[model samples]
Target: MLSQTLLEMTEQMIEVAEKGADRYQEGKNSNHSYDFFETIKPAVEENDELAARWAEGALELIKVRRPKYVHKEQIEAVKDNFLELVLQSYVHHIHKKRFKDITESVLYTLHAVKDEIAREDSR
Candidate 1:
């Protein structure tokens, strides 16, 4: 369940990031980059449990959720390039806050998926 959600988010993020990178590489403006949290924030915030847990040391969850070399490297590539374009476009503290929020949401889902996998493996 949560694993499916995490996978979906990962695919979606990758698609958006790849497209954004292509556009930017072709001399398109930074505005062509993906909008991180503006669209998803409402749905994410509606999950009160997720919000609460994420607020409670989400950084720890990041370490727990980190994946193996291949997938992790690909995801990091997308994340780094996308966020770099975001920063280039926005160039403001508010945008940075939004970036963090967007990143946290993704990381939280990844954490849930990893935790579930660990449970299944242990059983």
Candidate 2:
């Protein structure tokens, strides 16, 4: 049950994050210098760990039950370093809304991961 929910939640988070990126792109069209390593990297790294916990929870599904459309190489890449994949999900994405909203979503996802882990441990 937890595994399934984590999968669903991860999908939802990606959709919303991509939407935020789209909205930002549509509005901003200026020559700008942004330092990904200095700014986005830290936040993305921190959130990557958060997402990693959730990915760890879904390892079984990812390794053995991956969707048919997922390539074998893709699955191996994720299995090798799921956190890196999670970080990539955030990279290059623009945030149209207040950054706080994205942070809130990250925290929410982390909280869910924590709860799911605890629930699994109790069994």
Candidate 3:
């Protein structure tokens, strides 16, 4: 995909991350393993390795599943699920974040990458 495509993906990923963070409001010491929230490890611990692993999964999905998003409308088509993966991974990463909050550093990386991609992709 083009860098502009990547930029678009980054923007949407940020949006998805923001929205996804709200889904995990189950509170501390809660019961259930649904989503990426946990009662202990996720409530107070940080696991970059686990976060990296989930990010890798999203990248793999984008690579294998987003073959034709360069075409008009296909990006959005792929984005529907691509954003889902992004949301999932973001939540996985945010679970490592204290409590259930979005990670600024992660969002910063996306914003920074978006800027670089836009620099190269723009006319």
Highest lDDT: which candidate? 2
Using TM-score as the yardstick, the better of models 1 and 2 is: 2
How would you encode candidate 1's per-residue C-alpha lDDT over 9-91 as one tens digit per residue?
Answer: 44554444344334434534544454557854563443333334323322333457544322443334334444554444333
Q: Rate the local accuracy (lDDT) of all candidates.
A: 0.42, 0.47, 0.45
- TM-score against native, each model: 0.33, 0.37, 0.38
Residue 37 in candidate 3, Cα distance off native in Å: 15
For model 1, the stretches where C-alpha displacement exceeds 4 angstroms are: 1-3, 28-66, 70-81, 89-123
lDDT of 3 by residue, 1-123 (tens): 334444555675666555445445433456634544554345323233333443553455445544232332333333344333444543554345542322344464555445545444443
Q: Which TM-score value belongs to model 1? A: 0.33
How many clashing residue pairs appear in each of the predictions shown?
Answer: 0, 0, 0
TM-score order of candidates, best first? 3, 2, 1
- Cα error, candidate 2, residue 33 (Å): 12
Question: 46-115 in candidate 2: lDDT tens per residue?
Answer: 5565455545655554354443443334333333343433443345342334444543444444444444
**Which regions in candidate 2 have their CA more than 4 angstroms from the true location?**
1-4, 27-42, 64-67, 75-123
Q: Which one wins on TM-score? A: 3
Superposed on all Cα atoms, model 2 deviates from the true structure by an RMSD in Å of 9.7
